[PDB]
Symmetry: none
Subunit: 140 residues, 2 copies
Amino acid sequence: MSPSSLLGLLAGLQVVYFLWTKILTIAQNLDWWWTSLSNGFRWMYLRRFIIYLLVLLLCLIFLLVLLDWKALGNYLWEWALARFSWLNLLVPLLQWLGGISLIAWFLLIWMIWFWGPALLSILPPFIPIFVLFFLIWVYI
Amino acid sequence: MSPSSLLGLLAGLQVVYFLWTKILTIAQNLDWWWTSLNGFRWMYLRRFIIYLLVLLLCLIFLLVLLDWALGNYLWEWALARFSWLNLLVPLLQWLGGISLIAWFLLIWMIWFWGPALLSILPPFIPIFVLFFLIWVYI
């Protein structure tokens, strides 16, 4: 048997472990990089494997999201029967998120970016302001 | 609106607090996750990634509610890709038959041994592969 079967199987395996060690080395760096921003080795593999699962899921999801845009709104309209008071507040926002949309993409994303550090710093005083806003929403 | 509904709302106020702190707990879990397996600048971004994972996770859980139909619907469209996979699902079903408890047995032993085996595995692969190849050389 061996000459055909071995030749075909070894060629396929050879590529696969080369890609797998490439995939591992992609992940090895990636995983480091994320933590770098800041049973353990079995966890380091398992964490990566979980990351590969997230990547797998994200590939499927990324494809699914592309392919609807290429059904979400209609499923969101079933949720709109539950949501409808909060969805009436979303209807004006969907007038800004379409309306100002091109302008807001450039302008707002930069303005808010340094506002992102401002949000982190403001968040703690904003929690009492959000409680005040909630008391106003209960009042009127 | 009754005082008993207010006592339930107060448990909801610990749910608010529990939600905020739940974000930070995820980070804490991860921190040993890495260490087993200025700081705003990194910490902040890392909690955003947690947010994205939480959202994603919720979307995945919601897809499981749509399912438990969705699985079959996609799995049918995937047949458009399946060459081997049609034959391979039954093969995985050979272990599938070793089902209710015995899947869990397989998983549990695979973890429990698995680290030791994974060290052993490159040492073991030469003799292991040699043995199967010898059974084909026979």
